[PDB]
Design a protein around this motif. Sequence first.
Motif, PDB file in Angstrom:
ATOM      1  N   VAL A   1      43.198 -39.948 -14.915  1.00  0.00           N
ATOM      2  CA  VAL A   1      43.646 -39.306 -13.687  1.00  0.00           C
ATOM      3  C   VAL A   1      42.544 -38.414 -13.138  1.00  0.00           C
ATOM      4  O   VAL A   1      41.380 -38.535 -13.530  1.00  0.00           O
ATOM      5  CB  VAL A   1      44.942 -38.498 -13.912  1.00  0.00           C
ATOM      6  CG1 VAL A   1      46.080 -39.420 -14.317  1.00  0.00           C
ATOM      7  CG2 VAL A   1      44.731 -37.409 -14.959  1.00  0.00           C
ATOM      8  N   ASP A   2      42.909 -37.509 -12.224  1.00  0.00           N
ATOM      9  CA  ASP A   2      41.932 -36.588 -11.631  1.00  0.00           C
ATOM     10  C   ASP A   2      41.614 -35.429 -12.576  1.00  0.00           C
ATOM     11  O   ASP A   2      40.492 -34.916 -12.577  1.00  0.00           O
ATOM     12  CB  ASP A   2      42.464 -36.034 -10.320  1.00  0.00           C
ATOM     13  CG  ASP A   2      42.749 -37.124  -9.301  1.00  0.00           C
ATOM     14  OD1 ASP A   2      42.372 -38.297  -9.552  1.00  0.00           O
ATOM     15  OD2 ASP A   2      43.354 -36.816  -8.252  1.00  0.00           O
ATOM     16  N   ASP A   3      42.612 -35.005 -13.363  1.00  0.00           N
ATOM     17  CA  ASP A   3      42.507 -33.925 -14.365  1.00  0.00           C
ATOM     18  C   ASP A   3      41.834 -32.686 -13.765  1.00  0.00           C
ATOM     19  O   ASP A   3      40.992 -32.024 -14.380  1.00  0.00           O
ATOM     20  CB  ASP A   3      41.853 -34.439 -15.680  1.00  0.00           C
ATOM     21  CG  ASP A   3      40.314 -34.681 -15.582  1.00  0.00           C
ATOM     22  OD1 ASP A   3      39.512 -33.802 -15.167  1.00  0.00           O
ATOM     23  OD2 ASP A   3      39.927 -35.826 -15.900  1.00  0.00           O
ATOM     24  N   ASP A   4      42.269 -32.342 -12.556  1.00  0.00           N
ATOM     25  CA  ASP A   4      41.761 -31.168 -11.845  1.00  0.00           C
ATOM     26  C   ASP A   4      42.929 -30.278 -11.435  1.00  0.00           C
ATOM     27  O   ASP A   4      43.713 -30.642 -10.557  1.00  0.00           O
ATOM     28  CB  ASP A   4      40.934 -31.585 -10.626  1.00  0.00           C
ATOM     29  CG  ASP A   4      40.286 -30.404  -9.936  1.00  0.00           C
ATOM     30  OD1 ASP A   4      40.451 -29.272 -10.406  1.00  0.00           O
ATOM     31  OD2 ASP A   4      39.613 -30.639  -8.905  1.00  0.00           O
ATOM     32  N   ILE A   5      43.047 -29.129 -12.098  1.00  0.00           N
ATOM     33  CA  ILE A   5      44.143 -28.174 -11.927  1.00  0.00           C
ATOM     34  C   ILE A   5      43.594 -26.908 -11.263  1.00  0.00           C
ATOM     35  O   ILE A   5      43.841 -25.781 -11.703  1.00  0.00           O
ATOM     36  CB  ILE A   5      44.823 -27.926 -13.303  1.00  0.00           C
ATOM     37  CG1 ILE A   5      45.542 -29.185 -13.806  1.00  0.00           C
ATOM     38  CG2 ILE A   5      45.842 -26.799 -13.275  1.00  0.00           C
ATOM     39  CD1 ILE A   5      44.724 -30.026 -14.766  1.00  0.00           C
ATOM     40  N   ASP A   6      42.836 -27.096 -10.186  1.00  0.00           N
ATOM     41  CA  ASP A   6      42.229 -25.981  -9.469  1.00  0.00           C
ATOM     42  C   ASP A   6      42.803 -25.863  -8.065  1.00  0.00           C
ATOM     43  O   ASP A   6      42.068 -25.912  -7.079  1.00  0.00           O
ATOM     44  CB  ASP A   6      40.702 -26.147  -9.415  1.00  0.00           C
ATOM     45  CG  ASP A   6      40.058 -26.076 -10.785  1.00  0.00           C
ATOM     46  OD1 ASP A   6      40.745 -25.647 -11.735  1.00  0.00           O
ATOM     47  OD2 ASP A   6      38.868 -26.441 -10.919  1.00  0.00           O
ATOM     48  N   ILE A   7      44.128 -25.728  -7.981  1.00  0.00           N
ATOM     49  CA  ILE A   7      44.807 -25.610  -6.692  1.00  0.00           C
ATOM     50  C   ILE A   7      44.226 -24.447  -5.905  1.00  0.00           C
ATOM     51  O   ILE A   7      44.065 -23.337  -6.428  1.00  0.00           O
ATOM     52  CB  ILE A   7      46.318 -25.443  -6.902  1.00  0.00           C
ATOM     53  CG1 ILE A   7      46.886 -26.621  -7.695  1.00  0.00           C
ATOM     54  CG2 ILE A   7      47.037 -25.286  -5.580  1.00  0.00           C
ATOM     55  CD1 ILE A   7      46.694 -27.961  -7.012  1.00  0.00           C
ATOM     56  N   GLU A   8      43.894 -24.700  -4.643  1.00  0.00           N
ATOM     57  CA  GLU A   8      43.341 -23.652  -3.790  1.00  0.00           C
ATOM     58  C   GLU A   8      44.448 -22.768  -3.250  1.00  0.00           C
ATOM     59  O   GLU A   8      45.547 -23.242  -2.944  1.00  0.00           O
ATOM     60  CB  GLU A   8      42.536 -24.245  -2.630  1.00  0.00           C
ATOM     61  CG  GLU A   8      41.316 -25.054  -3.021  1.00  0.00           C
ATOM     62  CD  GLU A   8      40.331 -24.311  -3.909  1.00  0.00           C
ATOM     63  OE1 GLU A   8      40.294 -23.062  -3.846  1.00  0.00           O
ATOM     64  OE2 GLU A   8      39.569 -24.987  -4.634  1.00  0.00           O
ATOM     65  N   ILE A   9      44.144 -21.485  -3.112  1.00  0.00           N
ATOM     66  CA  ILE A   9      45.103 -20.513  -2.589  1.00  0.00           C
ATOM     67  C   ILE A   9      44.954 -20.508  -1.074  1.00  0.00           C
ATOM     68  O   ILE A   9      43.864 -20.233  -0.558  1.00  0.00           O
ATOM     69  CB  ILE A   9      44.838 -19.113  -3.168  1.00  0.00           C
ATOM     70  CG1 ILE A   9      44.646 -19.184  -4.680  1.00  0.00           C
ATOM     71  CG2 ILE A   9      46.029 -18.233  -2.910  1.00  0.00           C
ATOM     72  CD1 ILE A   9      44.087 -17.902  -5.260  1.00  0.00           C
ATOM     73  N   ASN A  10      46.031 -20.813  -0.365  1.00  0.00           N
ATOM     74  CA  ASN A  10      45.969 -20.911   1.084  1.00  0.00           C
ATOM     75  C   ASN A  10      46.826 -19.819   1.709  1.00  0.00           C
ATOM     76  O   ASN A  10      47.990 -19.654   1.320  1.00  0.00           O
ATOM     77  CB  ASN A  10      46.439 -22.297   1.551  1.00  0.00           C
ATOM     78  CG  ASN A  10      45.533 -23.413   1.055  1.00  0.00           C
ATOM     79  OD1 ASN A  10      44.379 -23.178   0.698  1.00  0.00           O
ATOM     80  ND2 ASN A  10      46.057 -24.635   1.026  1.00  0.00           N
ATOM     81  N   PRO A  11      46.300 -19.062   2.677  1.00  0.00           N
ATOM     82  CA  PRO A  11      47.024 -17.881   3.179  1.00  0.00           C
ATOM     83  C   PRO A  11      48.301 -18.201   3.933  1.00  0.00           C
ATOM     84  O   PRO A  11      48.985 -17.270   4.377  1.00  0.00           O
ATOM     85  CB  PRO A  11      45.996 -17.211   4.100  1.00  0.00           C
ATOM     86  CG  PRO A  11      45.140 -18.337   4.572  1.00  0.00           C
ATOM     87  CD  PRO A  11      45.043 -19.292   3.412  1.00  0.00           C
ATOM     88  N   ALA A  12      48.651 -19.480   4.100  1.00  0.00           N
ATOM     89  CA  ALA A  12      49.889 -19.820   4.787  1.00  0.00           C
ATOM     90  C   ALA A  12      51.113 -19.420   3.975  1.00  0.00           C
ATOM     91  O   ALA A  12      52.188 -19.199   4.546  1.00  0.00           O
ATOM     92  CB  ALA A  12      49.926 -21.318   5.091  1.00  0.00           C
TER      93      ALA A  12
END
Length: 127
Positions: free
Chosen positions: A114-125
Motif C-alpha cells: 500500500v502507500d503506508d503513509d500516515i502523514d495526514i496534513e492539518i488543514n485549517p478548514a
Amino acid sequence: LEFRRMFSGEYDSADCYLDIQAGSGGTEAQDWASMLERMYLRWAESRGFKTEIIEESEGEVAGIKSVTIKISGDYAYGWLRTETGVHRLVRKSPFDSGGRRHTSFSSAFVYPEVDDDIDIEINPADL
RNA sequence: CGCGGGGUGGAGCAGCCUGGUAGCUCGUCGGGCUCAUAACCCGAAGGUCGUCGGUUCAAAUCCGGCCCCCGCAACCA
RNA sequence: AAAUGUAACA
RNA sequence: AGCGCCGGCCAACUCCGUGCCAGCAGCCGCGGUAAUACGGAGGGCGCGAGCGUUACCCGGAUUCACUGGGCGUAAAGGGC
RNA sequence: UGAAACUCAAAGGAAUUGACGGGGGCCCGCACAAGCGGUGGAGCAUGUGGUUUAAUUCGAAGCAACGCGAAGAACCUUACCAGGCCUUGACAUGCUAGGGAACCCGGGUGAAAGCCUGGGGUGCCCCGCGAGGGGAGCCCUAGCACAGGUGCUGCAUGGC
RNA sequence: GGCGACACACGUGCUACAAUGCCCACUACAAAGCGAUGCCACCCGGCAACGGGGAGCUAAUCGCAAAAAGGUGGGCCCAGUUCGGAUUGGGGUCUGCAACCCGACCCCAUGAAGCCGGAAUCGCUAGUAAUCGCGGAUCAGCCAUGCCGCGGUGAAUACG
RNA sequence: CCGAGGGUAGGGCCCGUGACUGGGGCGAAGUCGUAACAAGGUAGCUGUACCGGAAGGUGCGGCUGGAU
Ligand SMILES: [Mg+2]
Ligand SMILES: [Mg+2]
Ligand SMILES: [Mg+2]
Ligand SMILES: [Mg+2]
Ligand SMILES: [Mg+2]
Ligand SMILES: [Mg+2]
Ligand SMILES: [Mg+2]
Ligand SMILES: [Mg+2]
Ligand SMILES: [Mg+2]
Ligand SMILES: [Mg+2]
Ligand SMILES: [Mg+2]
Ligand SMILES: [Mg+2]
Ligand SMILES: [Mg+2]
Ligand SMILES: [Mg+2]
Ligand SMILES: [Mg+2]
Ligand SMILES: [Mg+2]
Ligand SMILES: [Mg+2]
Ligand SMILES: [Mg+2]
Ligand SMILES: [Mg+2]
Ligand SMILES: [Mg+2]
Ligand SMILES: [Mg+2]
Ligand SMILES: [Mg+2]
Ligand SMILES: [Mg+2]
Ligand SMILES: [Mg+2]
Ligand SMILES: [Mg+2]
Ligand SMILES: [Mg+2]
Ligand SMILES: [Mg+2]
Ligand SMILES: [Mg+2]
Ligand SMILES: [Mg+2]
Ligand SMILES: [Mg+2]
Ligand SMILES: [Mg+2]
Ligand SMILES: [Mg+2]
Ligand SMILES: [Mg+2]
Ligand SMILES: [Mg+2]
Ligand SMILES: [Mg+2]
Ligand SMILES: [Mg+2]
Ligand SMILES: [Mg+2]
Ligand SMILES: [Mg+2]
Ligand SMILES: [Mg+2]
Ligand SMILES: [Mg+2]
Ligand SMILES: [Mg+2]
Ligand SMILES: [Mg+2]
Ligand SMILES: [Mg+2]
Ligand SMILES: [Mg+2]
Ligand SMILES: [Mg+2]
Ligand SMILES: [Mg+2]
Ligand SMILES: [Mg+2]
Ligand SMILES: [Mg+2]
Ligand SMILES: [Mg+2]
Ligand SMILES: [Mg+2]
Ligand SMILES: [Mg+2]
Ligand SMILES: [Mg+2]
Ligand SMILES: [Mg+2]
Ligand SMILES: [Mg+2]
Ligand SMILES: [Mg+2]
Ligand SMILES: [Mg+2]
Ligand SMILES: [Mg+2]
Ligand SMILES: [Mg+2]
Ligand SMILES: [Mg+2]
Ligand SMILES: [Mg+2]
Ligand SMILES: [Mg+2]
Ligand SMILES: [Mg+2]
Ligand SMILES: [Mg+2]
Ligand SMILES: [Mg+2]
Ligand SMILES: [Mg+2]
Ligand SMILES: [Mg+2]
Ligand SMILES: [Mg+2]
Ligand SMILES: [Mg+2]
Ligand SMILES: [Mg+2]
Ligand SMILES: [Mg+2]
Ligand SMILES: [Mg+2]
Ligand SMILES: [Mg+2]
Ligand SMILES: [Mg+2]
Ligand SMILES: [Mg+2]
Ligand SMILES: [Mg+2]
C-alpha cells in the motif's frame, strides 16, 4: 477470459510480500519452514519475480522460525494470494530418535503493498 | 525562541580538541568440536563518518548554513 | 568446574 | 415389522469408500491409502410392537466395611 | 480448624529385568599413551551437499552415506531432458479371420526411428499327367484377451 | 542433449613442495596373473604415440615382459631451481559409424599454485607401517590417481 | 386492649453482579534457564528466615527417604 481468475481482486498486481511462519512441532516444523521458503524462492525465480528477502530469524535447533520475502514482480499478488494458508507437512521426521512418522505445520500468509503513509496534513478548514 | 552537547559498519561505543593512520565488543559469513544444537576453538568479511558546500597540498577531524536527537532555561507582573 | 534434544514405539 | 448391536468387556465378520479428514466414544481407546472400532453394503448376533437414548435410585462398591476395611514405606498415629 | 468450582485416568507402595550414571570393582580392543607416516593448506583426480539447468535421472545420510550401487556414462549404457515417431506394442501365452508363409535383396522419404514400396522360390500327408483343396510348420495384416512401467510404498515383504 | 554444469561447501585419493633429492646413460633381482577378429617376438619407417611387414604360442613351450626402488658412472649446487607439472597455444597417433559438448596417448611450446600446511583429524604393534613397481576383473577405447590381488626394500615404539 | 399490615430507623445472614487484581487448571508448537531423579554433576528433603528473572540460593536446626 483467463483474466477472470486474476483480474478480480482489487490490487492483484502490487509487489506482494510472503510471510512464512513455523508452527506445531517445533524443530521439525522449523526445518519444514526453511524447506518451504526454499520452495517459494525457486518458484519466484522460475516466474520472473525478484527473490528479495526482507526479514529472517533462524531457529535455534535447526531451521527457520519465520521469514518475510518481497516477491518483487509482476501480478505477484494474484499468484501468491492463492498460496495463503497453513501448509501441513505430514512427513517422516528426522529429529525424532527411533525414526517415527510425524506431522508438523508451517504457514504462508501473503499480502500486497500500500502507500503506508500516515502523514495526514492539518488543514485549517476543520480546526 | 535561547544557551551547548551530539549524529561514525547490523547494534552499542571509541576516534576529533594538537588534520594525513577509522578501533573495541557483540553480531554476520566459512571452517572445526558434537549424534545434534548451544558454548568454545581457527580464519574472514564489513563503515556515503546526517546532509549541501569547502579549510588545506590534504577533512571523520577544522569553520559556516540546513536537517533530525539529547539536556538546560523560558523569569517580574 | 561443563547447558539442552519437543511433537505419532508397532 | 421394526429397533439396537457385531474391536475387548460382550453374542455377532467380510467387501468397498475414506485416509488423524469425515467421524465413533460407557471405559480402554479407534481414524495418518488392506480400518472386523468411521460411512455404506452383504452377512451375522439380540430382542420383538417394540427397540434404543437421556435422567434418576439400589446393585455390582468389603469404594463409610454392624454383618464387612484400614493407618512403617500405598491415603491414614495427634509433636509429647 | 479447613472446603468447593474445575480438572485428570491416573497419582501411588514394593519388588523384577534392562538401560544409564560427571557410582564403584575387575578386565579387553591401534582406545589412549609410546612411536612412524599421513589428512586438514596447494594443484589435480574422484564422490557428495548445494547452486544452476530444458534435463544436469535415481538411490546411499553420524560411526556403519560421501573412488558407496558404478569391476569402465562419447552413441549404447540411461532409468532424465528436447524433438521425430509406433498402438497387441521391443517381449510371453492365447483364440479368431485375410495374405502368403517361412528367408534373404534393393528403391523413395527422413537426423535416425518410422512411414511408403519395388523384388523374388514354402516343405508336408495330400485328388496331384489337371486348374485347383488344405493342415500346420513361420511370418505378415486386422482384432480381442493381454503385454509393458528403473511409476509409489524397504513403514506391507522374500532374498542378499 | 544431459548424467561431465560451477559464485561455493565437505569426504576419499593422486602428485608435490626437493639434495636420504631430480635428471641422463649403462647394469641387475620378483611374484601373481592374462592372452586365437587375442597376446605379439623380431625387422623396417617415424623424435614419438604409432604404422607397415612378420615368426611363435589352443600356451610351465610362445608373448605381454621392461619389473621399479636398487647398483655403477656423469650432470644439477639450494634458487620457486634441471624442484613441481597445473594451465594454455600448436602439431599429430589410435580406438570408434562418430572424440564439439565429452576419450586416452605422443611431440614442440607454455611452466601456475605449492618453501611441509589453523582449529581439528586418520592409519599402523613386524615382514606390519613407510616406500617401490607388476597383474587382473570391467573393457572398442577410456577419463583407474579407484578396486581386488602380487611381490621388492624394509623400520620406530609399547613405561603403563 | 390486642391486632393483618403499612411506615420510620438500625443491625444480621444469603445470592447475583463490579473497573481492576491474585493465583489455579488445561496445552501436540514459543522464550529463558536446568531445580529434582545417577554422588543428577553443590547428596536430597525439611520447618523457619532473608534474598533472587525463574526454577531456586544461603543461614540455623532437624531427617536418611543419602551414593562412595
Ligand atoms: Mg524573582
Ligand atoms: Mg445393543
Ligand atoms: Mg484392529
Ligand atoms: Mg452384553
Ligand atoms: Mg466376540
Ligand atoms: Mg475427506
Ligand atoms: Mg456407531
Ligand atoms: Mg496403512
Ligand atoms: Mg482401505
Ligand atoms: Mg484384494
Ligand atoms: Mg464398536
Ligand atoms: Mg464399520
Ligand atoms: Mg408385548
Ligand atoms: Mg424404554
Ligand atoms: Mg451405583
Ligand atoms: Mg455398600
Ligand atoms: Mg468393622
Ligand atoms: Mg482399604
Ligand atoms: Mg510419599
Ligand atoms: Mg505418606
Ligand atoms: Mg508418635
Ligand atoms: Mg498439624
Ligand atoms: Mg520403586
Ligand atoms: Mg534395579
Ligand atoms: Mg559405568
Ligand atoms: Mg585407533
Ligand atoms: Mg596417538
Ligand atoms: Mg602426527
Ligand atoms: Mg594435508
Ligand atoms: Mg585438499
Ligand atoms: Mg552453501
Ligand atoms: Mg538422489
Ligand atoms: Mg545421487
Ligand atoms: Mg564409510
Ligand atoms: Mg566407471
Ligand atoms: Mg566424447
Ligand atoms: Mg544416453
Ligand atoms: Mg535411448
Ligand atoms: Mg527393513
Ligand atoms: Mg530407504
Ligand atoms: Mg528384508
Ligand atoms: Mg549422453
Ligand atoms: Mg553420476
Ligand atoms: Mg564437464
Ligand atoms: Mg575446503
Ligand atoms: Mg582430500
Ligand atoms: Mg583419486
Ligand atoms: Mg599421498
Ligand atoms: Mg613460476
Ligand atoms: Mg620447472
Ligand atoms: Mg607463490
Ligand atoms: Mg626451497
Ligand atoms: Mg603434514
Ligand atoms: Mg613429504
Ligand atoms: Mg588440534
Ligand atoms: Mg592388533
Ligand atoms: Mg616417491
Ligand atoms: Mg596397476
Ligand atoms: Mg585384462
Ligand atoms: Mg580395460
Ligand atoms: Mg576428463
Ligand atoms: Mg394499639
Ligand atoms: Mg404489631
Ligand atoms: Mg410489624
Ligand atoms: Mg395497613
Ligand atoms: Mg483473571
Ligand atoms: Mg539442588
Ligand atoms: Mg540438575
Ligand atoms: Mg544436586
Ligand atoms: Mg532451608
Ligand atoms: Mg524479588
Ligand atoms: Mg533481572
Ligand atoms: Mg544468596
Ligand atoms: Mg543444614
Ligand atoms: Mg529431631
